[PDB]
Each structure stands twice: as C-alpha cells, then as structure tokens.
Amino acid sequence: HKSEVAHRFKDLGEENFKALVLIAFAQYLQQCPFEDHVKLVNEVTEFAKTCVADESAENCDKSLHTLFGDKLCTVATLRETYGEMADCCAKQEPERNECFLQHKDDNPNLPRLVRPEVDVMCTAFHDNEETFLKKYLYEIARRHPYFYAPELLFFAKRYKAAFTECCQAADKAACLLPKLDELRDEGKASSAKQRLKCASLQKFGERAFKAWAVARLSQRFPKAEFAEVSKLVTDLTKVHTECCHGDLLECADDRADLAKYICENQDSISSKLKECCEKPLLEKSHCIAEVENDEMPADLPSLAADFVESKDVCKNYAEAKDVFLGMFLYEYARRHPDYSVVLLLRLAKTYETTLEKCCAAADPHECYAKVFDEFKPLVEEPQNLIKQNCELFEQLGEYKFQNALLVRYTKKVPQVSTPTLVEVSRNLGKVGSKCCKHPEAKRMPCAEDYLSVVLNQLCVLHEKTPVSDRVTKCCTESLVNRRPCFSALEVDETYVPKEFNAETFTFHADICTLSEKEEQIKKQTALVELVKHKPKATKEQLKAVMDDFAAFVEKCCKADDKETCFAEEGKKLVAASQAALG
Ligand SMILES: CCCC1C(=O)N2C(N(C)C)=Nc3ccc(C)cc3N2C1=O
Ligand SMILES: CCCC1C(=O)N2C(N(C)C)=Nc3ccc(C)cc3N2C1=O
Ligand SMILES: CCCCCCCCCCCCCC(=O)O
Predict the structure, then answer these.
(1) Where are the disulfide bridges?
(2) Is 103 annotated as a binding residue?
(3) DSSP sequence for 463-520
(4) Rounded to whole angstroms, what are the CA distances from 136 to 113, 142, 152, 273, 391?
(5) Is 11 within any annotated ligand binding site?
(6) Cα 357 to chain center, whole Å?
(7) Taken in order 509, 514, 516, 522, is the CA torsion positive or negative?
(8) Cβ of 210 below 6 Å from ligand 3
C-alpha cells in the first residue's frame, strides 16, 4: 500500500523480518562485527513497527532501497572500513544501490569458520538460542554475499532443528555432527549451483539459458501447454538475471510473483503443486523449485510425427527457428524425466544441425528422415557410464570405489596435484554413493546435478593453477560438451614417472590413532603418489601392492610396540613392491 516496510513486515512476520534484515546487512557490511549488526536490526525493526502502527508516520512512505541505503550510509566507519564504498553515499538512488552491488565482495578474506566442540555448541544453544542462531546466520551470510537470503533462512531453521533434536539426545555427537556435515554439504552445493547458474548466463548467454530452462521445466511439468512453459521460461530468466545481479529485493519480488502466478494457474501447470502452494509466502519459491516431477500424459504421440514424418518441418522451422526447436525440446523433455538436461540439449543441438543442412537439400524429408537414429548413441553414452560405474560401486564400497577413481584419473591427468586429485576423486565417489541408490529412472538427473558442481569446482581450481591443456580444453568447452570431454580423456602416454621419494612412502604408527577420514586421506595420498611414480602399473600389480599394504597396517597397528613394526616391515614392503613393479 502506502508504506512498503509495514507491508513486508506484516507479510513476513517479526521473526522472519528480523532474520532477513540481518542477512541483508551482513551481506553488504561483511566486515562489521556482530554486535553492530544486531543494533541495526533492532533499529530497523523499531522503525518497522512504527510504520505498521501508523502507515503515515515519517519516512514510512520511502521505498525499501532508499531506506536501506540511508541506514547503510549511517555507519561512521563506512569510509575507514570500506573506503570506496562510502563514496556511494554521495550518489542518488538508484545509482546508490547500483554502486553498492558493485562493491559487494563475492569472496572476502574471512577466517574459516571452525566447528566448536558439541558440548560448547549445545550449551551456547541452550543458554542463548536466539543469538546462537543469529550469529550463525551472520557468519554464513557475510561469507556468501549472493546466497538468496530466503534459502539461507531455510537452512537456518534446519540448523536449529538439528540442535533441538540432538542436544537432548543421549549421545549428542552421534546425533549432531552428521546432521551438521550434511547441512554444510547441501549448503555448499546450493551455493555452488547458484553461482554456477549465474556464470552460465554470463558466458553462454540468454538463449542457452532459456533452452536449459525449457528442458528442465518440461520434465517437471509434462502436462503444461508449451505456451505456459514458454511464459515460465521467460519469467524465470528475468528472475535469475535480476537475482544474479545481486539486488535482493527485486530478486525476491520477482520470485514471489512467479510463485503466485504458478499457484494461481497450478491446475494447468502441475498436479504436484498443492503442497507447495499452501505454504507461507517465504517458502513457496523454495518448495516449487524442488517440486517432484509430475506424472506425464498417458496418450502422448510419437515425436517423429511432428518432427520427422511431417512435410512442413522446414516451413515451421524457418518460420521461427528458436520456437520450433523450443517445441522439440519441450516434447522430448516431458517424455524423458530420466534424461539429464544437458543430454536433452545435445539432442536438440543435433536436431538443429540436421535441420540447418537438410532444409537446404534437394528433398529435405529424405535428408532428415533418419535423424532420430543419430540420437541413440548420444543417449547411450551417458547411460552406459552410469551402469558401468554404479555396478563397480555396488561391488567395492564407497571408499574402494574412490580408490578406483583415484587410479583412473591420476593416470589420465598425472600432472594435477595429488591433493586436488584426492578431493575430486572422493567427491566423485560421493556422487556415486548418492546416485546409484536410485533406480535407473532417476540416476542420470542425479548425477548431472552433482557432477555439474564437482566439475565446475574442478575447473575453477585448475583455472587458477593450470597444469594441463586437456583439462582447460574441457573446462572451456561448451557446458554441453563438458562432461563428455572429461569422459573422453585418455591415459597420458607422455607423462614421465615421478622420481622415487623414500619419504613419500614411509608410515608411522600415528596412522593407527588417526580417524577413518584421516587414515583414508593419508592412504589415498600415497596411492596417487604411487601411481605418479609407476604410471604403467596394471590393476593387478597395483591391487596386489594395496593388499600387502592393507595387511601391513592391520599387522603393525594392533601389535606390541607399533613404531618398530612400521619401520622394519615398512622397509620390507617398500623394497618388495619396487621390484614387483620393476
Ligand atoms: C567451509 C564450509 C564451512 C561451512 C559450514 O559448516 N556451514 C554450515 N554449517 C555450520 C552447517 N552451513 C552452511 C550452509 C550454507 C552455506 C553456503 C555455507 C554453510 N557453512 C559453511 O560455510
Ligand atoms: C531444477 C529445478 C527447475 C526450477 C524450478 O522449478 N524453479 C523455480 N520455479 C518457481 C519455477 N524457481 C527457482 C528459484 C531458485 C532456484 C535456485 C531455481 C528455480 N527454478 C528452477 O531452476
Ligand atoms: C524458447 C525457445 C528457446 C529454445 C532454443 C533451442 C536451442 C537448443 C540448442 C541447444 C543450445 C546449447 C547452446 C550451444 O552449445 O549451442
């Protein structure tokens, strides 16, 4: 109505409002201490209540951006702490706001957040729950300036549930830690995806984004009309554009609008939206974004009717290429919730290439008549990888599967650093343990989603520390040829064995007191190193060596006077192994 703040306050509720204002300020004033942020929040909340009480009270008519900017420009240390940014206060809206986004550091030099001992966490939680959770929101928000504030709040609440549930438990640690580790993972995954989507829109452009969207939305809402999907793809692209620019308000209003639109037209979009559409304003978007795929229409024609057999294919195509290709994708995707999005893009691209040639050929219909046959090998490549890799994972376990990946990628890109190879391999191993659990129907989408982030993170590191032209080739390839380009990597013939280093292969009894995760990482680091030294070793030779090693440990650890055993037997092992691998 007349007062924007009061409106949001009433819509949101005091609790969420305060949470959001806190996240907002922390995302910009990433450097100010916690105590300072709490004060601003109180002041803004006070102001808010004033406007709710009397919508005509002073300033209550000012816009959110203006109000937000004015308070921001209140920090006296502004110039001394952010310098350049303070200059923004001299500008006027909307340049002031714009000037602020331009100075929001996407990655500050803040210290890593250390997880305290479970007992101190629980105690702090019980003694001052309110500030325990706000501190949490503060620390996270300031480290992820672009994380969509509301998603952040969603994470906060699960964070609180974990403490409520686990601090009462008989065995707090066994209950809390795992929930915390999972939260961190999901949080980092979610954050990495948001950045990934924004980066994509930048490099690859809008068209490619809309394409990605048509496909994903079609698998989700297979009953919706193409017209509806187009409309959505359009608004969703605007949303991400604004959300990527960093402006929280616009981002939020766009998402709110999209969600209501969807909920009002839900009976013609998807049946699986009842649940999501009842939830509170703050959770609609979140819910809808993760809503389960709907059941697909029962009486659905063969694509080849409208896209191969038809006589007016080139006519309909020439008439509006993108649109036609859009309908193709839409048709292909809603019949395949089991394909990864990028696979659907590959087919679409293939179809496009074909139409581009064939529509300028003698008899078009004869040129593009067998195009669908060109899809089969494209669809099959990713399918067999899943099958082959998931079976291997069912046999060996996550850990031994991770060891297999280690041997496999170290041989492919020996140049990469050992610690990097270890991390990426463990993560890939995780993708296997979380996706192979599902039935074929959902394996590909699962892998696609996790692999996209793992691969991008891979590219980022490497981008900073280049080591191989091949990796950079794949990393700068189309985000549709990316995974395939990495799958096509072959053993490196050139790589010359690393000079033997005795130190690298000597172990002390400390490895026994080490924690599993610690032990594994130590063993795996030796593994990569072994492979870098003897890149021609075969699975059998390696297998054999690892076995001896297995014993070696179990033998030394769990045996009177361990230190000695690791220096005596260790000498033997290392010597024998070298001869074995000549
Ligand atoms: C190095 C990562 C440490 C780290 C961590 O444990 N976090 C956490 N906790 C405490 C559950 N929750 C998060 C949720 C989302 C994001 C984006 C980040 C975190 N957060 C971290 O940054
Ligand atoms: C893969 C899920 C398809 C998908 C979907 O339904 N989305 C949606 N709505 C409300 C349509 N809003 C978004 C808001 C935030 C994020 C991060 C993602 C989406 N968006 C999607 O990407
Ligand atoms: C709303 C209609 C837009 C859909 C456009 C269809 C484009 C499909 C081609 C695949 C795009 C991948 C980009 C590329 O690598 O060339």
Answers:
(1) 51-60, 73-89, 88-99, 122-167, 166-175, 198-244, 243-251, 263-277, 276-287, 314-359, 358-367, 390-436, 435-446, 459-475, 474-485, 512-557, 556-565
(2) no
(3) HHS---HHHHHHHTS-TTTHHHHHHT----SS---PPP-TGGG---THHHHS-HHHHH
(4) 10, 10, 10, 32, 41
(5) yes
(6) 37
(7) negative
(8) yes
Residue 306 DSSP symbol: I
Q: Is the CB of 342 under 6 A from ligand 3?
A: no
Max intra-chain CA distance, the chain: 88
For the Cβ of 195 lying below 6 angstroms from any atom of ligand 2, the answer is no
257 is in an annotated binding site: yes
Asked whether the CA dihedral 252, 254, 255, 256 is positive or negative, the reply is positive
Q: Atom 2 in ligand 3: which residue has the minimum CA distance?
A: 326
Closest atom of ligand 1 to CA, residue 143: 22
Residues 6+ apart with CB under 8 A from 103: 82, 84, 85, 88
**Could you tell me how many helices (H) and strands (E) the chain has, helices first?**
30, 0
Is 65 marked as binding a ligand?
yes
User: Which tokens in the block code for residue 40?
Assistant: 């601003």
Centroid of ligand 2 to alpha carbon of 282 (angstroms)? 14
Q: Please state, as a whole number, how many other Cβ atoms lie within 10 Å of the Cβ of residue 503.
A: 5
Residue that is written with structure tokens 């394909």 in the block:
339
Rounded to whole angstroms, the Cα distance separating 292 from 515 reads: 38
CB burial of residue 515 (10 Å; 0-12, 13-18, 19+)? exposed
Task: Tell the residue number behind the tokens 């990888």, with chain if given.
Answer: 385
Q: Which domains does the chain have, with CATH numbers?
A: 1-105 (1.10.246.10), 106-195 (1.10.246.10), 203-294 (1.10.246.10), 295-380 (1.10.246.10), 381-492 (1.10.246.10), 493-567 (1.10.246.10)
Buried b (16+ CB within 10 A) or exposed e, 158-187: ebeebbeebbeeeebeebbeebbeebeeeb
Rg of the chain over all Cα atoms, to the nearest angstrom: 28
Task: Give the ligand at the shortest distance from the Cα of 162.
Answer: 1
Residues 6+ positions from 267 with CB-CB distance below 8 Å: none
Q: Give dist(CA 29, CA 51) in Å, integer.
A: 25
Burial 121-146 (b: 16+ CB within 10 A, else e): bbeebeeeeeebbbebbbebbbbbbb
As a whole number of angstroms, the distance between CA 534 and CA 578 comes to 9
Ligand nearest to the CA of 227: 3
